[PDB]
Amino acid sequence: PSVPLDPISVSNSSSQIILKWKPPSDPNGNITHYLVFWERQAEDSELFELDYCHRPFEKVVNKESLVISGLRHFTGYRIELQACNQDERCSVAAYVSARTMPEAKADDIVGPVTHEIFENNVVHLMWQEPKEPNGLIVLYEVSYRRYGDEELHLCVSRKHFALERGCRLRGLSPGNYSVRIRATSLAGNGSWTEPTYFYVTD
Amino acid sequence: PGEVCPGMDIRNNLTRLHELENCSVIEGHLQILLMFKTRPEDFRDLSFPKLIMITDYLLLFRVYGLESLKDLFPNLTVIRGSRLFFNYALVIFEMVHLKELGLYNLMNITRGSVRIEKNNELCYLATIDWSRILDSVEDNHIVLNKDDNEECGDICPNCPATVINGQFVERCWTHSHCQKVCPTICKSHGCTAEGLCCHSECLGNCSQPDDPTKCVACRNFYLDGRCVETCPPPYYHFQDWRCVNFSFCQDLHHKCCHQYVIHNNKCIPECPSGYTMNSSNLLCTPCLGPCPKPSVPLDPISVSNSSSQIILKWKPPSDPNGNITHYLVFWERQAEDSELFELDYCHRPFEKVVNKESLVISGLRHFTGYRIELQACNQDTPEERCSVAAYVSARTMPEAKADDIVGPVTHEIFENNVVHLMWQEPKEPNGLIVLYEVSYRRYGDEELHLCVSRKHFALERGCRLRGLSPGNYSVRIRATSLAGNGSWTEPTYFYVTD
Ligand SMILES: *[C@@H]1O[C@H](CO)[C@@H](O)[C@H](O)[C@H]1NC(C)=O
Ligand SMILES: *[C@@H]1O[C@H](CO)[C@@H](O)[C@H](O)[C@H]1NC(C)=O
Ligand SMILES: *[C@@H]1O[C@H](CO)[C@@H](O)[C@H](O)[C@H]1NC(C)=O
Ligand SMILES: *[C@@H]1O[C@H](CO)[C@@H](O)[C@H](O)[C@H]1NC(C)=O
Ligand SMILES: *[C@@H]1O[C@H](CO)[C@@H](O)[C@H](O)[C@H]1NC(C)=O
Ligand SMILES: *[C@@H]1O[C@H](CO)[C@@H](O)[C@H](O)[C@H]1NC(C)=O
């Protein structure tokens, strides 16, 4: 049979993929079913090392759309669609690629924001990284703030964060400082952590 | 050095691919397609390092398991494009699993363009500067690849770096192979590792400089281990790349398919129109008599290659209903997006184009949008009747140093040890400056930042750093405009008393 026509890969949900297509221009026989193959593409090795500072299938009978469920959030997938008119002699494949949606709170940081202060008044911050994120987390932003002043920032990269095990603020003048934290992943910006306060003794 | 083999169309399995074992030149095309049962293992120990040049085109279509060409064709240097695939000499299409090209010896594509489409894993594309490899990149078609939806961390090994259109980026083919860049005088001849130009008859690479017997490939024609400008008598040009004698063309003729003939010192498949095969000497000779046997202008495209030049192109109206006399180009400056000043991010000059279907508009403001109205006229003299307008919009390029901050970085210190910084804003920038970044730094520590918005900067008249611990601090400043990042100011130092 002819090639399946007009495939469109759309993702309306974080787990659902809705593949749509028109039937082959030349079925040359009574079409029995379609044959959808999907395949996870592995994540890019190099993304973990940069400083920014048979497969499950389905035979679709009498239908021209499919909703693929139970799929990993914000991940690219190779979809191979074929048509069969006897159950094998099937049409040449129709390739299409689709990237799933991210999750809502995958990048949001939970649990207590902890700190330590050393004999030299350095503040070693520690917070638990969001265990299961959208793809991976490419960096973090440390936003400390002294009441009344303007906002300050700091990009903490993967290698830095994973090495120190959180952050380390060296030599700040005394006072009560306000902190907000915002995880930056491949997908976007995980919601700002509620303001914490810490007072470095005078 | 190796043999010259004819073109191949290799399908289903890799078996027939081993017929290429000793080929150094493919006299024809190479098509590789429809291999659904091939696996990575099949290519891991599969290599053709002898292959240097292909005279027609290279096409790769639906080849499963192949992740790179760096091991298949490590020395492929030139694609001549004698025959093309829809005007393309290189086609890499729907190569699912291919992660990189790795054609680290490919220096020149003499004719035709590159079409790389629908390769969902293909990276190491942005690091290749195709303008160094092809004379015209305008007809390239590089779309729907992984490279587009920027997930490629194309990290080069030391490699040379060149500018794209503002962005200075390092150039490489793979994680382990840099892209070779020769001195500008050397361009098509190629060069050695030390940078000495190859001989003028070489193409792409040579083993020793200024020696026409040590070329990797020839610029014009190849004959008897030497690159020659033309085939001298009594030899004939064959397939626009090699010199052959009369006897060879004659043997081909008698084996035939196409029964080869000689014309204009070339051995060609058939006589051109109006000429006929003089049997004896195989020479095409001419036959006496027969041989015995208004609407809208279409598709406007606005392009800007310069900070001041705009190159507008268009097709004529589908129904001219008369002889078109001229075109009428109008341009008009759009001022600037009102909200940009109130958000915190922390007759017109014209031209009558006669006998031409393109215009280059000069003396235009940098990084500015423009409304261009194009019309067509097919009479001008008594009372003009012209076409309905063709609307098109284009944004000019930014300037190089428009956003760079000049003049002394000045400071003051108050009784409460607050440091009021003051520096002159870049008077004429690319559009406008949307914010600034203040980067103070204590020697040894990590970088610190501060986003200073427009209203803030304009109010305070520079910056104001409140309550810093004593010491000598280093400062860098970076203006951020609508266009990009005005170069970091050289490190200044200031010492706050203890
Ligand atoms: C390669 O393909 C041909 C074409 O049908 C087939 O006859 C041959 O058996 C195949 N060889 C292998 C090793 O798959
Ligand atoms: C390549 O050359 C070697 C040299 O002896 C020969 O054994 C081999 O058969 C050749 N390969 C082909 C495909 O002709
Ligand atoms: C490739 O070589 C030809 C032969 O002289 C030359 O005309 C062309 O400009 C070269 N292409 C480049 C340098 O991109
Ligand atoms: C030219 O070919 C030689 C052959 O080994 C190779 O070592 C060299 O790197 C090549 N030079 C360029 C610029 O490709
Ligand atoms: C832009 O193209 C025009 C048309 O050929 C040319 O005259 C001009 O020099 C080009 N400018 C740049 C910067 O390439
Ligand atoms: C400005 O940003 C571009 C983005 O790629 C970068 O290449 C360039 O080096 C930056 N300039 C400075 C002075 O940091």
Numbering used by the authors:
A (entry chain E): 595 to 647, 737 to 770, 774 to 888
B (entry chain F): 4 to 160, 168 to 266, 274 to 310, 595 to 647, 737 to 888
Provide text from the study:
The human insulin receptor is a homodimeric, disulphide-linked (αβ)2 receptor tyrosine kinase. The affinity of IRΔβ-zip for insulin was determined by pull-down from conditioned cell-culture medium and shown to be sub-nanomolar, i.e., comparable to that of the holo-receptor for insulin (IRΔβ-zip: IC50 = 0.55 ± 0.02 nM, hIR-A: IC50 = 0.46 ± 0.06 nM). Only a single insulin was seen attached to the complex, consistent with IRΔβ-zip mimicking the negative cooperativity of hIR, i.e. binding of one insulin molecule to IRΔβ-zip markedly decreases its affinity for a second insulin.
